[PDB]
Paper text:
In the present study, we report a PET hydrolase from Cryptosporangium aurantiacum (CaPETase) that exhibits remarkable PET degradation activity at ambient temperatures and high thermostability. CaPETase shows an α/β hydrolase fold and a nine-stranded β-sheet at the center surrounded by six α-helices and two 310-helices. Formation of one conserved disulfide bond (DS, C279/C297) and lack of an extended loop in the substrate binding site of CaPETase suggest that the enzyme originated from an ancestor of TfCut2 and LCC rather than IsPETase.
To provide a structural basis for high PET hydrolytic activity of CaPETase, we determined its crystal structure at a resolution of 1.36 Å. Interestingly, CaPETase exhibits a somewhat different backbone structure at the active site compared with other PET hydrolases. Interestingly, CaPETase also showed significant differences in the backbone torsion angles at the five connecting loops (β3–α1, β4–α2, β6–β7, β7–α4, and β8–α5) that form an active site, whereas comparisons of the corresponding loops between the other three PET hydrolases exhibited less differences, suggesting that CaPETase has a unique active site conformation. Near the β3–α1 loop, distinct residues positioned in the β4–α2 loop and a W105–L108–G124 network force, which form a unique side-chain internal network, appear to influence the conformation of the β3–α1 loop. A unique A192–G212–F248 network is formed under the β8–α5 loop, where catalytic H246 is located. Therefore, the positioning of a bulky F248 might cause significant torsional differences in the β8–α5 loop and β7–α4 loop of CaPETase. Finally, an R176–W200–F209 network appears to trigger conformational differences in the α3-helix and β6–β7 loop. In addition to the unique backbone conformation at the active site, residues forming the substrate binding cleft of CaPETase showed significant differences compared with other thermophilic PET hydrolases. CaPETase also contains a unique I102 residue in the β3–α1 loop showing the largest torsion differences, whereas other PET hydrolases contain a highly conserved threonine residue at the corresponding position, which probably enables CaPETase to form a relatively wider substrate binding cleft. Taken together, we suggest that along with unique backbone torsion angles, the positioning of distinct residues at the substrate binding site enable CaPETase to form an optimal substrate binding site for high PET hydrolytic activity.
Author numbering: 43 to 299
């Protein structure tokens, strides 16, 4: 059996729910080094450990703009480390260094170190925080997954990445348009499993409000890679519809992974 599987067998309804089956606790990040602080979210059930995901903010912004993700993901059986950057205008690569510094803090020094399986980690981010996932994955190829939401990075060559990569784009995003950011990054990745999902009519701020389409695939990606949980492949492969009225306007992946 897979010792990392958490929660009952999933359904479309279970990945779309605002809250998964785990009760959630939260507390601020206090005495962090190498990043700006933030908030941690975690299952209160200490009968088992969980993987952890660090989430990095993005468009001249703070963690609060993404904070719906804390309970949304932690309640599916993850430790979520939502961070502030050292400077709100930090470039992408520093944000990736800070993502790794916050994983290191969480697993070694934080009050919930004992709740995390330090061998099963992921990084995620919005906008320039999503652009920082290249540096996080290249510096830490042991990450199980990266998830970029409207990622922004002038560097389009992510060919050295070997970490399973999910990107979300927005069809109405003029800040980090798919054509100039997420799709070039996705197209350069030849050495990792990958998935690209574009949200119809969505602008650069789609990650800042509860979005069931983004959440259900984010959850599924973390389950599949952080937990090795192949019960979630069914939602990723073939993945979303792209018809004229669907909430997804474009979908590409390396199914069956």
């Amino acid at each position: 059996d897979n010792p990392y599987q958490r929660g009952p067998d999933p359904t479309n309804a279970s990945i779309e729910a605002a809250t998964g089956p785990f009760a959630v606790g939260t507390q601020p990040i206090v005495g962090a080094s190498g990043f700006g602080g933030g908030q941690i979210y975690y299952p209160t059930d200490t009968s088992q450990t969980y993987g952890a995901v660090v989430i990095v903010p993005g468009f001249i912004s703070v963690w609060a703009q993404l904070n719906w993700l804390g309970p949304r993901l932690a309640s599916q059986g993850f430790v979520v480390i939502g961070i502030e950057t050292s400077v709100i205008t930090d470039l992408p690569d520093p944000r990736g260094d800070q993502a790794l510094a916050a994983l290191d803090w969480a697993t070694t020094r934080s009050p919930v170190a004992s709740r995390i399986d330090r061998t099963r980690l992921a990084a995620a981010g919005w906008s320039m925080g999503g652009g920082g996932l290249r540096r996080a994955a290249l510096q830490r190829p042991s990450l199980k997954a990266i998830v970029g939401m409207a990622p922004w990075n002038g560097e389009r060559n992510w060919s050295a990445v070997t970490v399973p990569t999910l990107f979300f784009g927005g069809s109405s995003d003029a800040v980090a348009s798919p054509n100039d950011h997420a799709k070039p990054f996705y197209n350069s990745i030849t050495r990792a499993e990958k998935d690209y999902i574009e949200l119809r009519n969505a602008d650069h701020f789609f990650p800042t409000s509860a979005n069931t389409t983004m959440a259900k695939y984010f959850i599924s990606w973390l389950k599949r890679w952080v937990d090795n949980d192949t019960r979630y492949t069914q939602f990723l492969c073939p993945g979303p519809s792209t018809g004229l009225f669907a909430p997804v306007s474009a979908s590409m992946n390396t199914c069956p992974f």
